[PDB]
Design a protein around this ligand. Structure first.
Ligand SMILES: CNC(=O)c1c(NC(=O)c2nc([C@H]3CCOC3)cnc2Nc2cncnc2)cnn1C
Ligand SMILES: [Mg+2]
Ligand SMILES: [Zn+2]
Length: 313
């Protein structure tokens, strides 16, 4: 009841900044998440006995892959924490509860392979879910863990609040399918410019929340250069493994996944910041001004990749 989580001074201060790195001590990440829920949401949001049991089952169902792992789950949750804390009054109690859990759960049981690789392999998950294949799987896994005895962290919500929160989480996790990001950002671009963007319109919040999820999910590109550069090696370790697996099916992989084309990475990162990340944080900053530090940190990392190419590192 009166039991807070308290982080050491440096973490208590840095955890409030968008660029915060959750560190290499795995056994602290659960407490960092609970700490975030308690300040975002309150000490009453969840029964600690149940939250703690939910967190540890979720951790168990993340796999030991280089990038799409338990660390990514918590990293992506912290970004959402930082967005919610810098936009105090724009989000409901249910939304604050729902979105931290969505971010923690958004890549459950990821194998380190794209939706494309599942379809070309003819994986069973691609027959069960034709689009947003891994993402429908991740939402599935979330509902499953929620229905383990003692894991229903939402049990104390009204029947209808319960249905709204599971719906916020479902849309939030589907929106992490980057294939849906491009059209969602376009629609939000037009809505903001023509002035029709309206946060009391539920289909509009949904789009805003979808963009927040892309922003949180890609937030490894908004860290200090040394974090971002070393995270890029983890993500390319997965891509290259998928490329190896493509070649075993007898298919030339796209360049971002071919470990023979490592030379082309610096330029591939430029295209990625320009075509995906910069646009994402630009449109997000326009809708939610206080999230501007994510855009500034992203531009700094683009500049660092520009320096890598010019020989300067
Ligand atoms: C759409 N174009 C791309 O995805 C893409 C890259 N992507 C990526 O490089 C990349 N992709 C993702 C998401 C989307 C696909 O996998 C998870 C996340 N972080 C990424 N980069 C990253 C860089 N540095 C730190 N953390 C993450 C690299 N080159 N291209 C062409
Ligand atoms: Mg994902
Ligand atoms: Zn993710």
């Amino acid at each position: 009841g009166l039991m807070q989580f308290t982080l050491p001074v440096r973490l208590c201060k840095e955890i409030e900044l968008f660029h915060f790195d959750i560190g290499p001590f795995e056994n602290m990440w659960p407490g960092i998440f609970v700490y975030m829920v308690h300040r975002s949401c309150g000490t009453s949001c969840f029964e600690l006995e149940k939250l703690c049991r939910f967190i540890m089952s979720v951790k168990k169902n993340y796999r030991r892959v280089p990038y799409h792992n338990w660390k990514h789950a918590v990293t992506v949750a912290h970004c959402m924490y930082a967005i919610l804390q810098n936009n105090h009054t724009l989000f409901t109690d249910l939304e604050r509860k729902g979105l931290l859990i969505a971010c923690l759960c958004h890549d459950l049981d990821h194998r380190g392979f794209s939706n494309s690789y599942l379809q070309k392999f003819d994986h069973p998950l691609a027959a069960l879910y034709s689009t947003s294949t891994m993402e429908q799987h991740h939402f599935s896994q979330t509902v499953s863990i929620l229905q383990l005895e003692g894991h229903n962290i939402f049990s104390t919500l009204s029947s209808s609040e319960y249905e709204q929160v599971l719906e916020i989480i479902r849309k939030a996790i589907i929106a992490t399918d980057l294939a849906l990001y491009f059209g969602n950002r376009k629609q939000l671009e037009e809505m903001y410019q023509t002035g029709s963007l309206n946060l009391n319109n539920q289909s509009h919040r949904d789009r805003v929340i979808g963009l927040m999820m892309t922003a949180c999910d890609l937030c490894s590109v908004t860290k200090l250069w040394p974090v971002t550069k070393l995270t890029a090696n983890d993500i390319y370790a997965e891509f290259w493994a998928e490329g190896d697996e493509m070649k075993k099916l007898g298919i030339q992989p796209i360049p971002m996944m071919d470990r023979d084309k490592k030379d082309e990475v610096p330029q591939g990162q430029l295209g990625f910041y320009n075509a995906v990340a910069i646009p994402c944080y630009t449109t997000l900053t326009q809708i939610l001004p206080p999230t501007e530090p994510l855009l500034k940190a992203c531009r700094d990392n683009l500049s660092q990749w520009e320096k890598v190419i010019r020989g300067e590192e």
